[PDB]
């Protein structure tokens, strides 16, 4: 079930921004990124990590023909990861747990056997000065629709963030919080 802060995208589509102070932009060896999701839809992307201006850097959490995967480019090429034997866009809630470790990468889905992908060529290392993380698809133009929950990346819960109005927060389009159990 949806656990923690949860957020509807509904039709027309909506985003939740995050963007770190100017001087205060991360950068990291290693990423842990955990979505919930429930979703029909066969393509979307759901959260995207970018580097500042200037730096190709990014990291893409997205469906692709009804399977959850991510993308990632750390200044070599782009490296995607895939649950490819599993349909996940079938309105269930599901979970997916992304590890980076340099050009390496983990992915998981619910509990099904974890994907490993190691880029055959060398890849660097670092994603370097992280400054926005970017929910809902919508400027991607792939615009997500359904449910969104327990985000995790890096230390930062970025669903809980906005939910207490976090300064660094902007919420557009249509969006909804969740609200609370009885």
Do not use: C
């Not at 970018?50 to 399977?67: A, N």
């Not at 895939?82 to 996940?88: D, L, P, Q, T």
């Not at 340099?102 to 994603?127: C, H, K, M």
């Amino acid at each position: 079930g949806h656990a923690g802060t949860t957020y509807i995208f509904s039709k027309g589509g909506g985003q939740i921004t995050y963007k770190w102070p100017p001087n205060d932009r991360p950068s990291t060896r290693a990423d842990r990124l955990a979505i919930g999701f429930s979703t029909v839809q066969k393509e979307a992307v759901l959260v995207r990590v970018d580097s500042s201006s200037g730096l190709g850097d990014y990291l893409e959490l997205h469906i692709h023909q009804g399977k959850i995967g991510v993308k990632f480019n750390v200044g070599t090429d782009d490296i995607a990861i895939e649950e490819s034997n599993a349909i996940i866009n079938d309105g269930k809630y599901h979970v997916v747990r992304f590890t980076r470790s340099g050009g390496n990468a983990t992915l998981q889905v619910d509990s099904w056997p974890v994907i490993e992908r190691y880029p055959a060529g060398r890849q660097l290392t670092i994603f370097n000065s992280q400054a926005t993380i970017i929910i809902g698809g919508k400027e991607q133009g792939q615009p997500f629709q359904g449910q969104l929950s327990g985000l995790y990346y890096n230390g930062l819960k970025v669903l809980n963030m906005a939910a207490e109005n976090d300064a660094n927060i902007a919420i557009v389009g249509n969006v909804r919080l969740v609200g609370e159990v009885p």
